[model samples]
Target: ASSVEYDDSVTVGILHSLTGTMAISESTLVDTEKMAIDEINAAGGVEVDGKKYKIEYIVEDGASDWPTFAEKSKKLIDQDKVPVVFGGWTSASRKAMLPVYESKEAFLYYPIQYEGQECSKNIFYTGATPNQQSEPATSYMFEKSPAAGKPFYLVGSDYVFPRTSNTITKEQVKSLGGEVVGEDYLPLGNTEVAPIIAKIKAALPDGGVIINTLNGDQNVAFFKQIQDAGITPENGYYVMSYSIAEEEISTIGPEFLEGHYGAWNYMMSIDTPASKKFAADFKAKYGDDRVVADPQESAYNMVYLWKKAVEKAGTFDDDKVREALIGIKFDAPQGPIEVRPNHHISQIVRIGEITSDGQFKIVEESDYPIDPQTWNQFEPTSKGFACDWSDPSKGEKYKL
Candidate 1:
């Protein structure tokens, strides 16, 4: 049982990198979560067991360290006694935190797209999975320009997410009749990307595409140096990134990323009354200059999803809330989002090009929400696995 005493208030944890290499993308999540909690509190708080329980949150810094993430998660669940926590950016951080949540039987709502191949009853995954993001993105690049897709150059941060994502990419490319001409990995926050760029040019001097998974401020240097090397999209060198978003574009300078592309579930430029209102409200609160991206939006949506689950179960009990999460639907900014039995949600997938003004101009989008897949068929290690938490007897991670 949780040590949390729900006396007209319930406490949850917000863990993210507040001061470190990942702060560029993670700080906004903390702000977004705060906004969501404020909105909930303002609206008479959450109704549980006929009592209104205002959300009380304790924010912790992951410090961009994997072990630190685990440490913070343990503190939140054990010391703070928070039954639910929301946080994590990179897969490494989530992987580190997973055992803590699992051992304690606590809930963690992870709100970022990642390299799927995991399933946990202790976690609720709100972001796009590999099939929802990378697979479709690869397909778009190949179909749009078969020549550019062939002889591809893969680059990423030296981490689990990047390495796993590139592994899936290589498999997909091989099956699609495309070839990975060159591959490279650099440490997270590494600024010495010129050598990687030089290698990319040396390997494929003309008409090759780059699949980038670089995260954090390192993107700033990579994009800048690529431009300095005269590798423009017009010159047949295009970069389709899984990490770059409007937020990163704002940091890297839009001019340097003008014609590059990114794959995500939501962009500020989406044409919908819900999306427009969300952007207006976020800008109104944060400021007109502050931008929203996929991770931020997913983070915002997660709070409401949790609220719904808690209310449906009519208690702050961990297992009850988790059981109530299945089939819960929210009208998110992107569109309707449904929580499935597998502890993952459905999301809209879009392939967009970076505009000159630091926004994504949608180039391709799924006609409807795509269901999350924890394992990709293209990856050999995950091909025989599937996740379905609805069957309590099956446990969290399932192997077919």
Candidate 2:
């Protein structure tokens, strides 16, 4: 991207929101990524071929504006001269930066879960694909002999992510003989809760569930209004959200969400030494009141994984690090995590319900790392095809 030379220490680019409506969720992730870097530097960083380099970073604020995402990305690569980058929360932000990364020949370690159907060679994804979260969640949901056997209601924010997520949800439900009673969408931050609530009530008679893809601060209004309507999931009406994480629980008040479900790759309650240590360190550093969400955990894990990749590559070159990233495993808080051939990581899936104490109580989980399937075809394209970074002719061309 630039003719800039390298520095003594390895510096990473941090691009995320520090202000605006998305700040509440994104700032936490920024803190986590910074914390991971701090811990790595404290431990003397990574030693590559007997040369030790301390970790360094430069920060850029995306501010939840999609256009600013590209601007900040350009500055990081062209001006900051960082070796690796970690950033972007929303699918819009990802799309905004894809062109920049392609032109610059850089890579982004995105950590937020989203609607699948991409295999960007420039993006090494640490997020959950639909199959890693939604498919297994629906499988566990429909297995219920009573409540989950009926029709389902779908609600999402009006965006590519929510609409695509809902499409996959519908396909999974219908293929399993499950029925979808109703579906709807609204722009993010829409306070027109009356109409959606009425629709949910109308579908109540049919006994259905809500597959919620609502994101950011918009969820506060929806969940609160439903709680005001005295609509809890207790009466055979359930909501399995693919977006709502632990931070959203406290923001929306766990009382309203108590019994509602969340499908994710990592929950705070994961039973592993790494998970426990991470929670303790996070709480101690950020204060006990601050909750650790799945996205934050994923962001934190990306740093260590990148460190491993750097050591493996024996240099800080972007192209080399990108190649070294493939098949690099990290014993993350969620269990063992690794980069697959398609730039996606297989993950352990978990389905949790909110407790009265404002935390998720894990109800179901996969015992092993589940393969990432971005496309919802009957069979996997895993062994059939994968984006190869080494050869342009082999990798899927001009794809994100």
Candidate 3:
């Protein structure tokens, strides 16, 4: 495979919340993706046919607002006319941009794991879908260990990711002979979790666990409240969060969160040659004092993936790029991931236990890449969210 060269700069767009409720998580991606773009440029940029084009970025702050996201997306596509854009931390932001991108026939690479069952032609889902994040976590909880047969708690922020995730989690738990003892939701950035923590402590059954999907500063207060309330693994109060990461640990401090569990496609502590190289390069570029998060790494991988797609297609045209993006496999920091025909990547599902030093220790991992198909293997026809992927007229609407 040869690299393509462009006579001029290839402009790409990034829409992330640099300041807002999502900044805690979205800011890391903004920095990391820039690091990736720099590395690519240093290596002579992306190869299209035989031309090497230097990558140029047009970044905008979504500001964690849906309306802002929509407006920024339009500005990126209509004003900047970028070939591809990468951004959107929350499902709301993605949903807001979906229509504009589809209508304009632009490409978007979304880096956050979200509820599966959605198939989009104009979007590439670089994050884990519901099956990749929730199913494996539930399977681990249902294993014939101390967690088996115990009731579980579904706690999350009030959003599509959490709401639909908990619903599927509850169904999976029941199938495994377990029960959901309680469920709760709070708004994004809401810090008061003492009352919810109290409810969790009171409703907890022996061998029970918590599936936490809360994002942003809410994680800090939730962990503090849980620790202040004396919750521990001994009481069968394990926490498996999809959103909390090493960055949050620095904010909340590790002394209070040690022993909790989390499920993600990547962790800074993963013990692999690729991960070590990625960590070193990231640190060298962004400064060694910074911490790498799962979504940040995934976002970095997305840039390279787009380059690969463009190189394979031999052109930067929208239709060619979109077709080439599907079924494309690459060796990322997390491991091998293949983009499915639906534009979702096959992910490496991993489970980690929080250590005393504020990093997640990888305890277990799936042996192979988990497919991102809308239908589940265990329960076929249980579609995640039905939408017309081929409807040209109504295809722009974000279903969930």
Candidate 4:
């Protein structure tokens, strides 16, 4: 109920860990988000209420801490007065910021593949959900190498994403008649992976497979330790990662990552026209040495998706944009993607092998984008709950 002073340009917020352990991965998101903002600006910005306004953003550091994520999100929504924000890599960070957005009735575009037991009226999830990424990858692991994949080990960083994701994976493994031989976790950025590797070896002395969900710089240490311990694809030990991508592969050393597998919604090797243009444009703006991964592409696409929603609503009001976002469609680098009423987007799941040149050689992919399933049907605890924001009867449930 206050007088409004409108500016020529619309401001948004870019929240990511520019410094800290997760910066290794989250920093790329900032670059991609800015790239999308600049491109939209070049194309003449968004037309709202008969006025075209360029996009501007305020960048904030998450500091790789959940508390800091919450604090920064409040600043972006309140002090900065941004209607929408594009941020959050790990589910832990998203969880921390969820309450702030909900209480303030703002919007957040989250772009990361995570455990699917969450839903919020204030958040738009551009990342892949369980059915879109984890389930397909699990099936691939079982079908690709039946013998060695029967016994699985679950390893991850001690966080919400890993803990919940491994729970879903355990159920998936069981339904396939496979067993999880070992499960363990280390804190984020923890370089001590020796004990975990020893437990993995003890559980399956001969051979087995590993489902890795570790995030950030810790992956470099884990992969190096495993390689030093003589655990590799050639030695009958296989590994599949949900979080590690092309960017992480380059830092973790291609030699250490070679022969391992990663599952994501997008890969730099995709040969589609959209994908090629995205890669080329990113390289042109940032550097030839830069690489784009699933999270990065999703973050970039989140900006375009928001643009479409704003244009459709004909205003930048959070409530109007929220309604406009439902069932919107956009052609993304991964292929044609649609936003379902569940506040999540359709995504194609691709399984790729890490090559010696620090890129993925996509081996398997879904024929088309799979619908997002927020509460994975495979997990016992989350199977009963569902996320469908189209119906007003569901109430204004902000956090799950």
CA lDDT, every model vs. true structure: 0.87, 0.80, 0.80, 0.88
Which ten-residue region of model 4 has the weakest summed lDDT? 391-400
The true-versus-predicted C-alpha distance at residue 124 of model 2, in Å, is 0.5
Residue-level lDDT of model 3, residues 31-60, one tens digit each, is 888988987887888887677889999989
Candidate 1 lDDT tens digits, 274-293: 88988888888999998888
Model 4: residue 372 alpha-carbon error in angstroms: 0.8
Quality of model 1 by C-alpha lDDT: 0.87
- TM-score of each model, paired residue for residue: 0.96, 0.92, 0.91, 0.95
Better of 3 and 4 by TM-score: 4
Clashing pairs in 2: none
Candidate 2 error regions (>4 Å): 1-7, 378-394, 397-400
Model 2 agreement with the true structure over 104-136: per-residue lDDT tens digits: 988888998987677777788888988788777
Better candidate by TM-score, 1 or 3: 1
